From a paper:
A striking difference between the classes is the conformation of the cytosolic TM4-TM5 linker, which can be in an up or down conformation. In the up conformation, the TM4-TM5 linker is parallel to the membrane plane, while in the down conformation, the linker swivels towards the cytosol. TM1-TM5 are displaced in a clockwise manner in the down state compared to the up state when viewed from the extracellular side. In the down state, a short six-residue coil (P96-S101) from the N-terminus interacts near the side portals of the cytoplasmic vestibule. Symmetry expansion followed by variability analysis in cryoSPARC40 confirmed the presence of density for this short peptide only in the down conformation. In the down state, R334 shifts upward and does not contact D598. TM6a hinges away from the pore center in the down state, which displaces F572 outward. Therefore, the distinct TM6 conformations in up and down states could represent different functional states. 3D EM variability analysis displayed a lipid-like density at the top of the pore, which differs from the ‘hook’ and pore lipids of EcMscS, as it is not on the outer side of TM6a or in the middle of the pore, respectively, but rather it intercalates in-between adjacent TM6a helices. This density is associated with the down class, but it only appears when the adjacent subunit (clockwise when viewed from extracellular side) is positioned far enough to create a side opening to the membrane.
Flycatcher1 (FLYC1), a MscS homolog, has recently been identified as a candidate mechanosensitive (MS) ion channel involved in Venus flytrap prey recognition. FLYC1 is an ortholog of prokaryotic MS ion channel MscS (mechanosensitive ion channel of small conductance), which functions as an osmotic release valve, and is perhaps the most extensively studied MS channel. FLYC1 comprises a homoheptamer with six TMs (TM1–TM6) per protomer and intracellular N and C termini. A glycine-containing hinge (G575) splits TM6 into two halves (TM6a and TM6b), and the β-rich C-termini of the FLYC1 protomers come together to form a hollow cytoplasmic cage.
Numbering used by the authors: 96 to 101, 186 to 204, 222 to 244, 258 to 285, 294 to 354, 503 to 751
């Protein structure tokens, strides 16, 4: 596991000049320009940071084609051949448009997923590594924590890139297919019988792949929009405290307290209430106990006072705020009580939580012995027959 483990190449400038040289008069000059008009788009782009760098090339294609179609329209059985060509160009532009849309949406999703959530953890990681580099020119525990946190960020970053690439493949594939169909029908190539068969194929597919498409969509919303947890977070699902090992579109992989690896479908996880200790504020806890009904109220008062002193001597573990609650009188034999305390940590480090609680439980033991707090069973009257 990742967590829990024990020459032509640069001839474009020249090519562009050669293309310009192609005409100096007349009507076909725009058509000729199209052959190397990409250079013009590149220059326009130069003339025109995450989105900018990632999208400029998609924009260039879109506008490039737009111009080619516009000049084509204004340029002019060759009669039917040209109708065909015109529509082919239109289809190509539609394709580029959709391409641009697709790219944009994935860039938004991919970026906002992390940029608006853990920017600050990245900066903390950089800081500590700068410090380690400087130092090189409980210390060891600190050093290990710094490396483990960096690894966690690397894993989150890689899983996001992977998930986005998977989305990219699904969308690209459907986009390509629909563009083929669009081309065939707008150009007039497909005939009536072909339209009928394509129509049927789509309808049938709509049923077959219906649940699949819905499931993927819901999984995307769960993972990227709701985002109840990240990689490495300790989460609670139906009472199971589990560490998130990996996130994917269809599944989330978790490690149980005993490090069993669990594959948990997102289509199910989407309907559950999910806890997240990593994202929690300092967490609290409870120690329940019972005392005899005859315990003097003064000993109850001494118990409260002794507990307060303990907690105040250990402020690295406990917040000063606590409550002692008397809850119930059972028969006239038992008083049920509970101690409510506040930890100075959240429970991402579960073992540390238990160690601190364990000491508090032993302190309670000690206080009861010193104050002579006891619990007795009710007496039983016996009658003897011979
Ligand atoms: C149902 C159509 C495909 C869905 C999109 C591609 C896969 C999305 C990611 C899900 C996890 C599959 C890849 C990891 C498999 C493994 O554990 O080796």
């Amino acid at each position: 596991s990742r967590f829990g483990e024990p020459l032509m190449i640069e001839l474009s400038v020249f090519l562009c000049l050669l293309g310009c040289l192609v005409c100096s008069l007349w009507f076909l000059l725009l058509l000729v320009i199209f052959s190397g008009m990409l250079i013009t788009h590149w220059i326009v782009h130069v003339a025109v940071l995450y989105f900018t760098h990632g999208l400029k090339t998609s924009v260039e294609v879109f506008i490039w084609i737009t111009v080619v179609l516009a000049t084509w329209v204004m340029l002019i059985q060759t009669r039917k051949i040209l109708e065909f060509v015109t529509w082919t160009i239109v289809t190509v532009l539609i394709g580029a448009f959709l391409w641009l849309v697709k790219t944009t949406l994935l860039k938004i999703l991919a970026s906002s997923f992390h940029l608006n959530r853990f920017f600050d953890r990245i900066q903390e990681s950089v800081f500590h590594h700068s410090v380690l580099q400087t130092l090189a020119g409980a210390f060891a525990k600190w050093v290990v924590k710094v490396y483990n946190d960096q690894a966690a960020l690397k894993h989150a970053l890689n899983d996001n890139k992977t998930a986005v690439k998977q989305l990219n493949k699904l969308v690209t594939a459907i986009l390509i297919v629909m563009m083929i169909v669009i081309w065939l029908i707008v150009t007039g190539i497909a005939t009536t019988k072909l339209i009928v068969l394509l129509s049927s194929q789509l309808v049938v597919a709509a049923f077959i792949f219906g649940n699949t498409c819905k499931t993927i969509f819901e999984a995307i919303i769960f993972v990227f929009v709701m985002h109840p947890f990240d990689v490495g977070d300790r989460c609670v699902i139906d009472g199971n405290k589990m560490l998130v090992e990996e996130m994917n579109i269809l599944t989330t992989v978790f490690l149980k307290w005993d490090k069993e690896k669990v594959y948990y479908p997102n289509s199910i996880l989407c309907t559950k209430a999910i806890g997240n200790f990593f994202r929690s504020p300092d967490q609290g806890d409870v120690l329940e106990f019972s005392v005899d009904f005859t315990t003097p109220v003064l000993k109850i008062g001494d118990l409260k006072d002794r507990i307060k002193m303990y907690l105040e001597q250990n402020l690295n573990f406990w917040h000063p705020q606590h409550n002692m609650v008397v809850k119930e009188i059972e028969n006239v034999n038992k008083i049920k009580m509970a101690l409510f305390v506040n930890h100075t940590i959240n429970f991402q480090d579960f073992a540390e939580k238990n160690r601190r609680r364990s000491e508090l439980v032993l302190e309670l033991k000690k206080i009861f012995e010193e104050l002579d707090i006891k619990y007795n069973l009710l007496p039983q009257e016996i009658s003897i027959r011979n």
